[PDB]
Design an enzyme around this catalytic site. Structure first.
Site, mmCIF file in Angstrom:
data_model
loop_
_atom_site.group_PDB
_atom_site.id
_atom_site.type_symbol
_atom_site.label_atom_id
_atom_site.label_comp_id
_atom_site.label_asym_id
_atom_site.label_seq_id
_atom_site.Cartn_x
_atom_site.Cartn_y
_atom_site.Cartn_z
ATOM 1 N N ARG B 46 0.742 -1.369 0.021
ATOM 2 C CA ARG B 46 -0.110 -0.109 -0.079
ATOM 3 C C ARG B 46 0.823 1.187 -0.099
ATOM 4 O O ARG B 46 1.878 1.529 0.949
ATOM 5 C CB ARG B 46 -0.859 0.029 1.219
ATOM 6 C CG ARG B 46 -1.708 1.228 1.268
ATOM 7 C CD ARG B 46 -2.816 1.067 2.515
ATOM 8 N NE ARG B 46 -3.278 2.618 2.897
ATOM 9 C CZ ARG B 46 -3.090 3.327 3.976
ATOM 10 N NH1 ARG B 46 -2.052 2.944 4.747
ATOM 11 N NH2 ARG B 46 -3.641 4.442 4.057
ATOM 12 N N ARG B 88 -9.730 19.699 8.737
ATOM 13 C CA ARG B 88 -8.693 19.813 9.566
ATOM 14 C C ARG B 88 -9.055 21.092 10.435
ATOM 15 O O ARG B 88 -9.713 21.997 9.777
ATOM 16 C CB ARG B 88 -7.248 19.824 8.992
ATOM 17 C CG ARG B 88 -6.166 19.248 9.660
ATOM 18 C CD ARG B 88 -5.703 17.782 9.028
ATOM 19 N NE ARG B 88 -6.913 17.105 8.986
ATOM 20 C CZ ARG B 88 -6.883 15.733 8.708
ATOM 21 N NH1 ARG B 88 -5.501 15.149 8.583
ATOM 22 N NH2 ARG B 88 -7.977 14.990 8.683
ATOM 23 N N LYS B 235 -12.984 2.675 -0.037
ATOM 24 C CA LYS B 235 -12.809 2.527 1.344
ATOM 25 C C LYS B 235 -14.043 3.387 1.964
ATOM 26 O O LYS B 235 -14.546 4.314 1.810
ATOM 27 C CB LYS B 235 -11.672 3.440 1.787
ATOM 28 C CG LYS B 235 -10.333 2.703 1.198
ATOM 29 C CD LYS B 235 -9.089 3.839 1.580
ATOM 30 C CE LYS B 235 -8.799 4.408 2.986
ATOM 31 N NZ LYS B 235 -7.531 4.674 3.154
#
Lengths: 382, 483, 475, 472
Positions: B46, B88, B235
């Site tokens: 990965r 963030r 994902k």
């Protein structure tokens, strides 16, 4: 299921019954024109009864069979020599194969191209071994079908079956050797033992006897035949009904209709699981896989590619809902296969699989096909 | 009670069926480290595109290739894990962390130039007030701070803190039960897919934060004829991805479950259900699933996992995972090689509990009108048990045949043969499958030479039974004896 | 193992019930007593013949036989005459010969004395029923004719085969509904004025063609015939076609194979028998296989192989009862015939796979009562149970258990006299009259089975509907 | 996914089948929060005799009794023995020592020795006769691992495998080595005889069971006066695992101490041991408790972690009868909230349970009459779609035999026996009702009131009898 479905009256459907039909030759059906007509009615095997007649009589019958196949090029009739043997006159109370029987086997059976020897009054496995040895090099293409007709042959049945290629059950004769209330038990037992081992069984005598004179059977006769089919018989056999009867053709087609109606009641998926319950070889495992896949992909036909017949026999033993078209280059294998329930035959020279599907109106375009050889192919008609 | 306790030999635990994905990082940048991880059981590499650039990642790829030259029978697949959308917090006065008191107000603004204090901070997500409504919860800094939305405007949100916490600058944020309107594949992720993934020989795109089937269809469209040999592995990380899972899976080639992230989006006691549900659904359609995040985290600093870590990994295998994934354990940990060994060892322990006959029967009932190819795959698995085959050979071009057999989880190893290099790579993510590349092909001589190579590799002894299957529109099942 | 003869202790314990037809061959009390010993469970009165006085005398002989055998609880079944179609009289009463291909006129004027060319028919609606191409069978199917013309009071037919026929012979109309009352005034008189007062437990209704026929008999029975159960006889296409609606209204079914063979092609009758037996099995309704059972035993002391197999296969199909007709009514060997059937039945029950019969019934069919009956059969197999006790008032508990065909004997305990008699038709059930609580009843029944069926320390499953299941040890 | 992501009502997660054992301590001592834990789901109260005195524990027993007066709920009280303990000695100036990886550490038998970084004492006098070169010693919850290099008569020489700081009197584990100490010593004997029997404890949970002799020893010790007490051996080490089968054969139930097992065997093997033991208890119908490392973060946090909930869920899916809380309720900030969370987790995991599979698995040993009837009762309840199963029992056997088959429907056990009722608080799927000592009709008259069961079917069983009734 509604009752209306049971009472539905079709030439194309009952012609496609799975059980094989043995017809006895005689004055009433000898003729080429009659034999050709009996092939259309569903005749698979011709029985020569060597209790009567001589080599000259039976030779002309065989020639007439040969000419009947010339008019029906798609058909392959097996010929079965039924011995005289050591044959209360309602006659019952000597060698199983004497000098006469031996002469018939060696000097007719072999040279005349008979595919099966049905041996009368067989009492032990030693009888089968004697016949096997009698056949030898020149008769290696001939299969042995002992007839269980007495207590001795019933008592030694397991060892007879182990040596034999198939079995013929003479119910009428048995009913004069054991109590009548127990013959149905004996018949059931013998058919099942034959089935579990994949060896052809023929149910013989007292089938549609009233049809010797009548163009229609009785309720009782039809039901008796039907239960032989439900017992698991590969073949049903006509005797006097075809040899000396007034309606040989109508009897065969009647037999085909009984077989078709009886095969209606047959539970095919449960028959597979039952045979699986009663370790195993590669070829046995692949045959099972083939039958499973066939129902799974809802196959039209099962193609059994075989040289010895073993592959076809092995698949037929699991009694699939799908027709089994056996493809072989062996002429005698094709003949031996005429006695196996659920199998039909095609003579062939991988192109075979494709060229067979062209010949096979057995299929529609785009239908699934399961072909088998230690391999299993699944195809779609193109 | 004592067969459970006996130490397992390398011969045994290296034969585990579950596949291992390892994240590349400075801890395993070294070619010698990578080679040892291959031996330990690494099947997929990965590349995390949250960090690094096309140059540094290209170098990593060279190191993987150099490792594979030392292990020529190994066929490592390379997976590009996209950065995707990130939320963030902003900066703080004098770069000093702030403590929020429970019940206190905190304004969150969308002006990212705003240097914050204990009463006001910034968020990088400008559409935050158009996404979040009053009553919604916002998690900050791995859910260590929780705030509830009280008021929204166009360029701000006013929240009440639900606990007492200290947070620093530029910390992550989660929006439980709110769809993130940011592009799942932004200009930077697209650049990574088109200008790294394709030309660098990446085999999979693991797409972070997939929220709809549209996202997958977009990636597929993006990849195009040039990216056709590349598989898409969404994902699943939030509620939107959960809610849309069936549509996502129908479009996907495989799935990655991000448990730690799911835990930031739904209640903790529901995540174990979502993982089981998602694994089972992937199993049912034979599409590979990777269980990822929070696996053996303690092994970043410890040579051994905790009881609970190993039990977690084990239960993902028992759930039916194809792959287990290491992240920081291999990327930044002190024990990258030992962690892969430990993972391989845990997988082997878990696969001891696996009832293979029961799994095949469960799957037959699970799949309803089944295809010719699947029916032959079923038969091959059933036949293999019946003749006690040593190996199952799947001859396959697209991988479908091997994927179909693997789906029914046979007790025997599947050796997949292919002429397609990308198919060989795609199969590194399939549980129970080993690979062997062959030239293009007539089937008989291919099976014949495969037994020769499998005999030397100690997979088959002479006299043993082998089931071989070739699928696509002819399908084939063959049973042979090893010579 | 199959060549080994059965002892009387073995074959008497067969589970299939036996119906015997009353007649002059078994008229005397001594013969009836021996037939009980041989395995007779139900006594069929054939109301095609006799009258209320002669049949009453038969019932008194049945009752007298029962005094000598107090353990037997024989049910009495009244079999209606029903509709009959008959040919007329002939010139000088001489039988006529029909040649194949020749034409035969059939007229509806029953006063006409016929000849080779023309005969009468008792069925006035014949021209309304029959069309060109229909077959008409005469005299147990010995003559077949095909319809060529229809008129108002006549039908013109072509002889299909050569045959000689006498006077007043039976006729069959394959594939045609008979427009005659299934229950006429004479049948109604028998049911009401003999059936009810004389203590009959079943009416077997001849030639049932619709559920309408069953609803009629039921309505006729009313409150007064409430203790009486209805068993339609399926004999033609109409009964077949409407079988399911008939079964739904009926308490049980009698299959008349020989008569069906006069109505449909012979190859289809074995199919009809199988389908109908299975359908009765699924709803737990008793089925009687009848006609052409051991026919050769009317004259011979032993059956044919085919006869033995036919009876065996009816058992294997799942029949509750097998029936003797002429063999007991007019035959030379009424007692021996009953023994033979009991023996065939025992031999056929040997081939029964009981675990398969339970499993197949569970897939084919859930009420509280049926669940407990199911649980009872399984539990019985689970322990090594010797017998199953069925405590029942209506007989339902006993029937629900019997339906699942357990390998264990079922002892049915009942205070109800007519329930005890109804159960005589239920395969695998033996009956016992009781007056008592649910515990006192199980006690004395365990002691009476010991003096027969249970050894010291065997498991016993007891079932009681009102719904309980009890497992006990004999001590 | 929509079904998974729906918030479960308090009506729903209250109806969970798995049982909850709570450890008593300062954080949950008082009647008030004790009552609130009862209707959060607490089924059993664990008294930890590693700490406290008889008077301290007697005040707790009193608080339980008072709490049960306010919820007339029938809590089982379990006495958890101290058992054998291995401890490091005292240290120089009472200050912790840190050991560097590779460094030598001598461990001595003289427990009066004030230790250095070079040498410490151990309370286990047979240490040098137990441990051999190559053995590992674990100190302070596995903080420090040392390997044995040398053994003397009154000392062991070791090498630190790990850098760690340890304080005084820390616990010690001897992986793969039997602790040659009485499992039940004179102090454990005093606890069972002079507290357990007189104070009304229902279970003895025996710490550190290494032999089946330990179980038979406690049983003889209880004798006639303690015959109403059941014994739950705790399995914590290799000897407990190696002797598990014969331990289980003598036991009434089992407690699996995972956290302590992780200190005795490799971590990747504990999940196997837990799975094996739970299954072996299921097969035999004996209750099993999953203890230690359950919701540990909830000592300080109001929420558990993702990993913690999943660990609990898979214990329930393995087939655990009980889950146990330790420091989460004994100490820690949110004892009540932890019980609720535990009940909610249990309810979610029980959603994955395939009940038809569990009955057929348990059916797949020539079974008894009472076993057959219990099978029939589970089979019938599913067939008839019963609301509840009523289990009439004096010994509890009938209720335990039914619960073993894990029915979809709740089992309402009815008993005259006070001890049986409390013994059954440990059986999954069972709730209880005390009967005065027909009884079915009065039980249905109370079940209708508790909203559990008009028109529904009910399966009742007595052990051998089965009944199917329909409520009016």
């Amino acid at each position: 299921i509604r009752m209306s479905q049971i009472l539905e009256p079709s030439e194309e459907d009952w012609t496609a019954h799975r059980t094989r039909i043995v017809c006895t030759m005689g004055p009433a059906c000898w003729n080429v024109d009659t034999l050709v007509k009996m092939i259309d009615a569903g005749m698979n095997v011709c029985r020569l009864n060597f209790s009567h007649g001589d080599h000259e009589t039976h030779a002309r019958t065989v020639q007439n069979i040969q000419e009947a196949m010339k008019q029906r090029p798609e058909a392959r009739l097996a010929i079965l020599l039924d011995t005289k043997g050591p044959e209360i006159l309602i006659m019952n109370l000597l060698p199983v194969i004497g000098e006469k029987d031996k002469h018939d086997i060696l000097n007719f059976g072999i040279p005349m191209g008979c595919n099966f020897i049905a041996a009368s009054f067989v009492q032990s496995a030693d009888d089968v071994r004697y016949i096997r040895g009698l056949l030898g090099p020149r008769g290696r293409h001939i299969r042995i079908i002992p007839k269980i007709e007495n207590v001795e042959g019933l008592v030694n049945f397991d060892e007879i079956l182990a040596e034999a290629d198939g079995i013929m059950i003479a119910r009428g004769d048995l009913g004069m050797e054991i109590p009548p209330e127990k013959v149905f038990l004996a018949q059931k037992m013998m058919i099942a033992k034959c089935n579990v081992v994949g060896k052809p069984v023929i149910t013989a005598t007292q089938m549609l006897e009233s049809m010797i004179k009548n163009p229609r059977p009785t309720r009782a006769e039809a039901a008796d035949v039907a239960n032989a089919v439900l017992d698991g018989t590969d073949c049903v056999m006509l005797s006097g009904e075809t040899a000396n009867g007034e309606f040989p053709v109508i009897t065969v087609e009647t037999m085909a209709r009984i077989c078709y109606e009886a095969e209606t009641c047959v539970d095919y998926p449960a028959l597979y699981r039952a045979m699986c319950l009663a370790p195993i070889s590669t070829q046995e495992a692949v045959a099972r896989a083939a039958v499973e896949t066939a129902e799974c992909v809802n196959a039209a036909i099962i193609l059994a590619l075989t040289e010895t017949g073993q592959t076809a026999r092995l698949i037929a033993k699991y009694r699939p809902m799908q027709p089994i078209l056996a493809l072989s280059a062996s002429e005698s294998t094709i003949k031996h296969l005429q006695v196996i329930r659920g199998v039909t035959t095609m003579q062939v020279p991988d192109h075979v699989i494709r060229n067979a599907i062209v010949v096979a109106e057995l299929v529609t375009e785009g239908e699934s096909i399961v072909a088998v050889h230690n391999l299993l192919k699944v195809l779609t008609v193109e």
